[PDB]
Amino acid sequence: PSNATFGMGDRVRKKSGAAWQGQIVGWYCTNLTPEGYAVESEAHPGSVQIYPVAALERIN
Amino acid sequence: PSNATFGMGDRVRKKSGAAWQGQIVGWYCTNLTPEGYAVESEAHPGSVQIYPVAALERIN
Amino acid sequence: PSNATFGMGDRVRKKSGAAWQGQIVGWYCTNLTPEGYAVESEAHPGSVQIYPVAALERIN
Amino acid sequence: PSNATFGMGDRVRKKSGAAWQGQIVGWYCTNLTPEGYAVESEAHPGSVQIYPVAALERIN
């Protein structure tokens, strides 16, 4: 996108707290989370979790 | 999209099993769920859940 | 329990951020969340979400 | 429990569809899922997902 922090297929991980790591497979937007991503785990194929951009970092 | 079943802002609900109802706020795609949507609950603002297109119906 | 903050069937809600409200239907414990609860939404029957005790308040 | 299929600490995995594997750390019960478990991923510490007993198998 003309702006999004990450793109489809980027490899990312949660920066802290519960762990999560895998590829970007989607996106979402609400008032509470104006920039969110769906991430498919690279360890557990098919399992997807969603998070706000701030919780995530590209790897790298 | 030139194809997606639903668009941003459509009002939908889960067709069966656990209930869910609200607006489409996002989308995702994996091998297991090639067409998925993120839906923000209309009863619990800020809470989003994701589901495959087949689990959902537009209301209607 | 001889200690838990809430019991099965208590009515609670998330104190801030994304909303959630319903009845306590379960419990969990990890190093990261040593006292967690499963809560079934009172608006969307069958849908359960889990949270750490600190995120929750009894209503009341 | 005098009945539960699994106990705290059992190692289990999802039998099919999206993958998940780790240790039992909790439990839940609703009309829709009268016997459910919370499972902490062994690959992503701190991340917990909940499932009905039928979706799970002990490993084994």
From Swiss-Prot, chains A, B, C, D:
GO terms for biological process: one-carbon metabolic process; response to antibiotic; response to methotrexate; response to xenobiotic stimulus; tetrahydrofolate biosynthetic process. It catalyses: (6S)-5,6,7,8-tetrahydrofolate + NADP(+) = 7,8-dihydrofolate + NADPH + H(+). The keyword Metal-binding does not apply. Its EC number is 1.5.1.3. Pathway: Cofactor biosynthesis; tetrahydrofolate biosynthesis; 5,6,7,8-tetrahydrofolate from 7,8-dihydrofolate: step 1/1. It comes from the Bacteria. The keyword Oxidoreductase applies. It is an enzyme of class 1 (oxidoreductase). Substrate binds at I50. NADP(+) binds at K14, K15, S16, G17, A18, V48, Q49, I50, Y51. Changing Y51F: Decreases affinity for dihydrofolate about 9-fold. Decreases affinity for NADPH about 22-fold. Keywords: Antibiotic resistance, Methotrexate resistance, NADP, One-carbon metabolism, Oxidoreductase, Plasmid, Trimethoprim resistance. GO terms for molecular function: dihydrofolate reductase activity. The active site is situated at the inner surface of a pore formed by the four subunits. Key enzyme in folate metabolism. Catalyzes an essential reaction for de novo glycine and purine synthesis, and for DNA precursor synthesis. Homotetramer. Type II plasmid-specified enzyme is practically insensitive to trimethoprim and methotrexate. This is Dihydrofolate reductase type 2. It comes from Escherichia coli.
